[model samples]
Target: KFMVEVRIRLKKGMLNPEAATIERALALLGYEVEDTDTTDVITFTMDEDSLEAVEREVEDMCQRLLCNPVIHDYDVSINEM
Candidate 1:
């Protein structure tokens, strides 16, 4: 089996209000940071044996449903499990 991990996050210059709000809350709690960013990780097991095909499908998934291509960037990594 193969394990696929997809990491998604907003692209540069995009406003991340979620992270900004968290940063502000942390500051109020006395935990201040210079900057903050958030990312989403989706991991799943697949039966595909061909690395090429697996990568292609992962890219397609991210493009079609997992992420907004215009405002987000994503990375796909596969590993044997």
Candidate 2:
């Protein structure tokens, strides 16, 4: 079995309007705000036999669908179980 972890987040210098609005609300709720950002983590199991093939497939998936390459960054980690 294989475990794949994908992390997706906005790139540097990108304005996070959603985070900024939420920060204001959180501060009103008594949460001391410093700054805020957003990240998405996805984990799944792949029942593939070839790690090389799986990694290639995962990379292709990321390139095509996981993140907007121009606006976001993405990383992947794979583990054999």
**Candidate number achieving the greatest TM-score relative to the actual structure:** 1
Off by over 4 Å in 1: none
The residue-level lDDT of candidate 1 at 5 comes to 99
RMSD of each: 1.1, 1.3
Worst 10 residues of 1 by lDDT: 45-54
Give one digit per residue, the lDDT tens place, for model 2 in 1-81: 999999998898988888888998899999987769888998999988699988999998889988787898998999999
In Å, residue 65's CA in model 1 sits off its true spot by 0.6
The digit string of per-residue lDDT tens for model 1 on 1-81 reads 889999999998999999999999999999979769999999999988688888999899999999998999898899977
**TM-score for predicted model 1 compared with the true structure:** 0.92
The per-residue C-alpha lDDT of model 2 at residue 39 equals 87
Looking at model 1, how many pairs of residues clash?
Answer: 0
Number of clashes recorded per candidate: 0, 0
